[PDB]
Structure 1
Amino acid sequence: HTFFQKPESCPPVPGGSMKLDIGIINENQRVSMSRNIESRSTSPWNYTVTWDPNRYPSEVVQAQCRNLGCINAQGKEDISMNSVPIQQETLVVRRKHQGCSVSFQLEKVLVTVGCTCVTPVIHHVQ
């Protein structure tokens, strides 16, 4: 069984659709990060704002590491270290149909949120 499955003893609903209640729980929260984190980082990154009007959130910001290496104390690239992305799974809502027939469906989006500086690994399988 899955999370969205209603108990088997319950009467069936036409279309197999579920009730989505109004309002987003804890909507008032906002991300709090160090000022200019993406630029002050030794593994700096750039952002790409992706837009979809039939997706909630409509704007999904994607990060991309600026360099292969990490930035040293002198402000130069160090290729002995690697800037690597941090990717996280998220849920967005896809808006379907139109007007009175509007329905919603969950969608999994992989978001690259930022980069970190790692010591490289020599992989056993290339």
Structure 2
Amino acid sequence: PRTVMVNLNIHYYDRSTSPWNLHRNEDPERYPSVIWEAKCRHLGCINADGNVDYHMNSVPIQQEILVLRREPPHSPNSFRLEKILVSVGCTCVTPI
């Protein structure tokens, strides 16, 4: 147990060939409770003509992020640090 104190008071890509939308992911047992996650708009990538090219793939960029998990569950003042995978945007990839 590595217990620390934390004060919780804090103090564009539309032209992408692999564009994305943001999805509201909510968890009451987590701090921060809301995490906005990227979801690729298409399976393929946008052409020079503005069309979807299915020989290319829009893939989500997944990053490991540290979040706070209520420990014990429902606790207003006690947490454990947790690693979660979050989709942070989309990139365009050549298939294997």
Q: Which TM-score applies when normalising by structure 2? A: 0.82
Runs of 4+ in 1 over 4 A off after TM superposition: none
1:1-126 alignment, distance < 5 Å: 17-23=1-7, 35=12, 37=13, 39-97=14-72, 98=75, 102-121=77-96
More helix by share: 1
Higher RCO (CA < 8 A, seq sep 6+): 2
Rg larger in structure: 1
RMSD: 2.0
Gaps of 5+ in 2: none
- Number of equivalenced pairs: 93
More strand by share: 2
Q: Percent identity?
A: 56
